[PDB]
Design an enzyme around this catalytic site. Structure first.
Site, PDB file in Angstrom:
ATOM      1  N   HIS A   6       0.820  -1.174   0.000  1.00 33.24           N
ATOM      2  CA  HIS A   6       0.000   0.000   0.000  1.00 33.24           C
ATOM      3  C   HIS A   6       0.855   1.223   0.000  1.00 33.24           C
ATOM      4  O   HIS A   6       0.476   2.236  -0.517  1.00 33.24           O
ATOM      5  CB  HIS A   6      -0.890  -0.025   1.222  1.00 33.24           C
ATOM      6  CG  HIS A   6      -1.945  -1.078   1.163  1.00 33.24           C
ATOM      7  ND1 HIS A   6      -1.993  -2.131   2.049  1.00 33.24           N
ATOM      8  CD2 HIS A   6      -2.986  -1.250   0.319  1.00 33.24           C
ATOM      9  CE1 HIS A   6      -3.022  -2.903   1.755  1.00 33.24           C
ATOM     10  NE2 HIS A   6      -3.642  -2.390   0.710  1.00 33.24           N
ATOM     11  N   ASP A  12       3.655   6.086  -5.423  1.00 36.27           N
ATOM     12  CA  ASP A  12       3.666   6.258  -6.876  1.00 36.27           C
ATOM     13  C   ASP A  12       2.830   7.493  -7.190  1.00 36.27           C
ATOM     14  O   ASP A  12       1.613   7.420  -7.372  1.00 36.27           O
ATOM     15  CB  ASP A  12       3.127   5.014  -7.574  1.00 36.27           C
ATOM     16  CG  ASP A  12       3.393   5.012  -9.072  1.00 36.27           C
ATOM     17  OD1 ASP A  12       3.512   6.105  -9.668  1.00 36.27           O
ATOM     18  OD2 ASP A  12       3.487   3.912  -9.659  1.00 36.27           O
ATOM     19  N   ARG A  15       0.928   7.518 -10.657  1.00 33.54           N
ATOM     20  CA  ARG A  15      -0.303   6.737 -10.604  1.00 33.54           C
ATOM     21  C   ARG A  15      -1.394   7.468  -9.828  1.00 33.54           C
ATOM     22  O   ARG A  15      -2.499   7.686 -10.338  1.00 33.54           O
ATOM     23  CB  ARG A  15      -0.016   5.372  -9.974  1.00 33.54           C
ATOM     24  CG  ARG A  15      -1.255   4.626  -9.516  1.00 33.54           C
ATOM     25  CD  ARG A  15      -0.917   3.637  -8.417  1.00 33.54           C
ATOM     26  NE  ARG A  15      -2.098   3.251  -7.652  1.00 33.54           N
ATOM     27  CZ  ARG A  15      -2.509   3.866  -6.551  1.00 33.54           C
ATOM     28  NH1 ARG A  15      -1.860   4.907  -6.055  1.00 33.54           N
ATOM     29  NH2 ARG A  15      -3.600   3.425  -5.931  1.00 33.54           N
ATOM     30  N   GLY A  39     -11.202  -2.717  -5.871  1.00 27.26           N
ATOM     31  CA  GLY A  39      -9.848  -2.799  -5.358  1.00 27.26           C
ATOM     32  C   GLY A  39      -9.447  -1.529  -4.641  1.00 27.26           C
ATOM     33  O   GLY A  39      -8.396  -0.946  -4.925  1.00 27.26           O
ATOM     34  N   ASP A  60     -12.733  -4.414  -1.599  1.00 28.44           N
ATOM     35  CA  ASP A  60     -11.429  -5.061  -1.642  1.00 28.44           C
ATOM     36  C   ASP A  60     -11.481  -6.296  -0.758  1.00 28.44           C
ATOM     37  O   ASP A  60     -11.968  -6.228   0.375  1.00 28.44           O
ATOM     38  CB  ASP A  60     -10.316  -4.114  -1.178  1.00 28.44           C
ATOM     39  CG  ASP A  60      -8.952  -4.511  -1.715  1.00 28.44           C
ATOM     40  OD1 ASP A  60      -8.589  -5.701  -1.600  1.00 28.44           O
ATOM     41  OD2 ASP A  60      -8.244  -3.635  -2.254  1.00 28.44           O
ATOM     42  N   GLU A  88     -17.700 -10.434  -7.120  1.00 26.96           N
ATOM     43  CA  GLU A  88     -18.679 -11.450  -7.482  1.00 26.96           C
ATOM     44  C   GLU A  88     -19.406 -12.023  -6.273  1.00 26.96           C
ATOM     45  O   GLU A  88     -20.408 -12.722  -6.451  1.00 26.96           O
ATOM     46  CB  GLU A  88     -17.996 -12.582  -8.256  1.00 26.96           C
ATOM     47  CG  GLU A  88     -17.372 -12.164  -9.584  1.00 26.96           C
ATOM     48  CD  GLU A  88     -16.009 -11.511  -9.424  1.00 26.96           C
ATOM     49  OE1 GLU A  88     -15.595 -11.256  -8.275  1.00 26.96           O
ATOM     50  OE2 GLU A  88     -15.350 -11.255 -10.453  1.00 26.96           O
ATOM     51  N   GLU A 102      -8.157   0.551  -9.697  1.00 27.32           N
ATOM     52  CA  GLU A 102      -6.717   0.487  -9.903  1.00 27.32           C
ATOM     53  C   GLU A 102      -6.551  -0.988 -10.092  1.00 27.32           C
ATOM     54  O   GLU A 102      -6.587  -1.726  -9.121  1.00 27.32           O
ATOM     55  CB  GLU A 102      -5.982   1.057  -8.711  1.00 27.32           C
ATOM     56  CG  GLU A 102      -4.569   0.576  -8.478  1.00 27.32           C
ATOM     57  CD  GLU A 102      -3.676   0.749  -9.672  1.00 27.32           C
ATOM     58  OE1 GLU A 102      -3.870   1.706 -10.442  1.00 27.32           O
ATOM     59  OE2 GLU A 102      -2.766  -0.078  -9.821  1.00 27.32           O
ATOM     60  N   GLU A 111      -1.236  -9.813 -13.276  1.00 26.35           N
ATOM     61  CA  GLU A 111      -2.008 -10.068 -12.075  1.00 26.35           C
ATOM     62  C   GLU A 111      -3.027  -8.970 -12.055  1.00 26.35           C
ATOM     63  O   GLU A 111      -3.204  -8.301 -11.037  1.00 26.35           O
ATOM     64  CB  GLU A 111      -1.107 -10.031 -10.860  1.00 26.35           C
ATOM     65  CG  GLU A 111      -0.072 -11.139 -10.864  1.00 26.35           C
ATOM     66  CD  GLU A 111       1.058 -10.894  -9.888  1.00 26.35           C
ATOM     67  OE1 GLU A 111       1.478  -9.728  -9.733  1.00 26.35           O
ATOM     68  OE2 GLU A 111       1.538 -11.874  -9.285  1.00 26.35           O
ATOM     69  N   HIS A 244       5.681   2.533 -10.211  1.00 31.61           N
ATOM     70  CA  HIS A 244       5.928   1.286  -9.498  1.00 31.61           C
ATOM     71  C   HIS A 244       5.740   0.061 -10.384  1.00 31.61           C
ATOM     72  O   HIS A 244       6.024  -1.056  -9.937  1.00 31.61           O
ATOM     73  CB  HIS A 244       5.026   1.187  -8.264  1.00 31.61           C
ATOM     74  CG  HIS A 244       3.692   0.561  -8.529  1.00 31.61           C
ATOM     75  ND1 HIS A 244       2.592   1.288  -8.926  1.00 31.61           N
ATOM     76  CD2 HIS A 244       3.278  -0.726  -8.434  1.00 31.61           C
ATOM     77  CE1 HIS A 244       1.560   0.476  -9.074  1.00 31.61           C
ATOM     78  NE2 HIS A 244       1.950  -0.751  -8.784  1.00 31.61           N
TER      79      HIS A 244
END
Lengths: 293, 286
Positions: A6, A12, A15, A39, A60, A88, A102, A111, A244
């Protein structure tokens, strides 16, 4: 609750400020609307949306949601942000106008959580927005001094011949920050998150030597955000400021001693990440298999 | 591939296992060795090359290269790689140590000793965990200040997450500012003993004490009349480095001052109550 991951992302600035400046640019469209944060991590993007006119729902599956609730409480956004651990599987309090997420990975699709973003779009999104709504690029690289050392190590390991290990080194992709790019760049593929999962298993490319030794390809991805009529974007390439994500390097089995005007043409196949790349070097033919595990 | 390269390039560890096998080469002759966690099989090849049949057992897909390397180095007749033994064993060689000695350790070794090994040897057969204090005031202060203001938002609640996370890094020798003191293990007699100590540290100079650096020592069996190595900040580099546990407060200590404490270790790893006379910390490894 791994704080380094985190920290890395929050530190970053390219970002984080990209997501912020994109929300602010469209803050008129965020006003009085429902946002889903896929997320959410610590919830920084959710707090950005809520403070600039948004209810925001953050989802998340990590234990960091406990921290997110505490942070959202401490900054006065408890009435506008609802956080849910588990997409889901969770049950949204609303049956959403904007999706902030993100989701990008190292090779963009390594990933990545884009499968979840498409799921959020298909099941919860009203003309709705998607921040961000991406392309993968590549170019040639000079890494002869570093690569030769890594490969030479296995010729003699405490007396033993470790030669069969070399193919392993050529097959593993390298995530690192790459002046050493000596060819032109080409675009592998584009993705429009508003219309694009079957499209992820997928291209031809052409590169021309700008001057050197070519030992592999460096790959990166570009990101573009939605903007009103008449957009915020950033790159993760070796020519852009640090991120990153850095870049992803794929080595060649042979080292091309190329002069300017020489060509590297190829076809890259990406499939669930299995990456098979067939090359052609005109100044001949070779291949490379890589596995991301 | 990363890990295996890291193992082999740790010359302190690998040569320790080699020199221990060589020291006991008389006891390796014409015997059967079990390599628990053989990885690439270098330790298996060492035993076979210096007089040993060696059986390597690793649950990773690496056993395939082990085979290829063993095949290439002329040990196919002496090494068999990989719930699983062709023999109903005299020596157990194992590379099992983890961070803090116990985290993600393969100390499987006790199972091999109890089920497959009387009077057999175990390389290595003795462990110890040590600790001392350090000054990392400048780096630690940076990490915790970041969270006072993160893009305008108060991220205060996060600091405890940072003060509780153990740090695996190499500490410079000059930053240890107290004496060193936790537990011994005898692989011949030691699973319930892993969940387990009191310690006492004296400041060797006037400095800031921001946490404890911990390491572990390793000793190998030797014939009558031993090869060992340390992973401490006073020893050469190892791929284990050291493990740092931060204090909530930074002790401005003078020479002769004392830090008395009790460390409790219990299973992932829960980890310390202090007393600093001039008169706590919880850590989870996940």
């Amino acid at each position: 609750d791994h704080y380094g991951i985190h920290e890395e992302m929050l530190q970053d600035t390219v970002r984080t400020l990209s997501y912020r400046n994109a929300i602010i640019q469209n803050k008129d469209l965020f006003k009085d609307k429902i946002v889903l944060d896929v997320g959410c991590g610590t919830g920084i993007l959710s707090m950005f949306a809520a403070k600039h006119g948004a209810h925001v729902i953050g989802v998340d599956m990590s234990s960091i949601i406990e921290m997110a609730k505490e942070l959202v409480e401490l900054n006065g956004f408890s009435d506008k942000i609802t956080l849910l651990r588990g997409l889901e599987d969770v049950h949204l309090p609303f049956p959403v106008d904007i999706i902030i997420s993100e989701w990008m990975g190292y090779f963009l699709l390594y990933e990545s959580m884009m499968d979840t973003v498409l799921y959020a779009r298909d099941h919860y999104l009203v003309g709705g927005l998607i921040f961000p709504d991406c392309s993968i690029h590549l170019a040639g690289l000079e890494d002869s001094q570093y690569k030769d050392e890594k490969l030479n190590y296995w010729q003699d390991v405490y007396g033993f011949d470790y030669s069969p290990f070399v193919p392993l080194v050529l097959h593993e992709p390298i995530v690192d920050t790459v002046n050493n790019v000596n060819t032109t760049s080409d675009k592998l593929i584009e993705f429009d998150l508003n219309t694009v999962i079957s499209d992820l298993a997928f291209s031809n490319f052409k590169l021309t030597a700008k001057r050197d030794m070519i030992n592999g390809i460096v790959t990166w991805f570009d990101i573009v955000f939605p903007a009103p009529k008449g957009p915020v974007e950033f790159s993760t390439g070796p020519h852009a400021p640090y991120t990153h994500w850095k870049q992803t390097i794929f080595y060649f089995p042979d080292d091309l001693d190329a002069e300017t005007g020489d060509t590297i043409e190829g076809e890259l196949v990406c499939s669930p990440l299995n990456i098979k790349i067939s090359y052609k070097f005109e100044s001949r033919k070779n291949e490379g298999s890589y596995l991301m595990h």
